[PDB]
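[retry 2/3] Iron-regulated surface determinant E: previous attempt timed out, resubmitting with same input.
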Amino acid sequence: GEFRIVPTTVALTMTLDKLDLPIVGKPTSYKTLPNRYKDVPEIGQPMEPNVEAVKKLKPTHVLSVSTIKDEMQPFYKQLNMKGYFYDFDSLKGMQKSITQLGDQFNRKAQAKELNDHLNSVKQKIENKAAKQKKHPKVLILMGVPGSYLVATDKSYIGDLVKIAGGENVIKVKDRQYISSNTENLLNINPDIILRLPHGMPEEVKKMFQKEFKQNDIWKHFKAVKNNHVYDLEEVPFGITANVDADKAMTQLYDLFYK
Ligand code: HEM
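[retry 2/3] Iron-regulated surface determinant E: success.
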């Protein structure tokens, strides 16, 4: 009858806190987790939780996200439990996931409240963006340890850019993040370049720093010449949606129009 839930991602953990739910394990993260989970044990990093540690807690439900569904299949196999891959790649997707979590875990009122808040902020920002005369063309880079990718409309940051009134210069939509070389970056004309870090932020920012100094293509971008290359904080600007999308939407709108 009772649920023993283990969220494997920081976004899921913060979502279950907004839903007023207890959990039995939590991800290993450098990020701030809700205070109420201070004492629950860590189960390893989101992308590779410890199979042995998760089993130990006798969970009823182990939760993951759409963004890494394929890379998580072996984990769930070894766990020998049902895969849960909540869509956290857009506001609409996360809204659906929140409703689903509310239904699964008897938190329908709490889910509706959070969804209503996020919907209200989204609508308000989209309303403001509609009234803007100009809309920046935007290139979004997602830096990970060793390399950087380009974010599409299918990624959370892509959705945020769209909501805030930006036009993503990357038009391909079949995956969330694409290689630095999938679309050619000489064929785009962005007003704004956004750089988001992941996994190892310190290493990523010095990597972006060195890339922009050493790869000749960047000096020629007008966003670079006009000082509109922005390094975004991984919190609220992460690799998936999170319940602090209200802050992310508001902050991005304010960066675009100031
Ligand atoms: C390139 C090598 C990569 C490395 C070494 C890496 C490493 C990490 C690390 C260290 C974390 C935990 C950060 C924390 O302490 O909270 C994390 C989280 C995560 N990563 Fe990556 N990452 C990489 C690329 C990617 C890519 C390409 C994706 C998929 C688009 C991805 C998806 C995720 C997701 C969904 C989480 C959980 C986010 C959350 O906790 O809400 N990672 N990764």
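[retry 2/3] Iron-regulated surface determinant E: The radius of gyration is 19 Å.
[retry 2/3] clearing retry counter.
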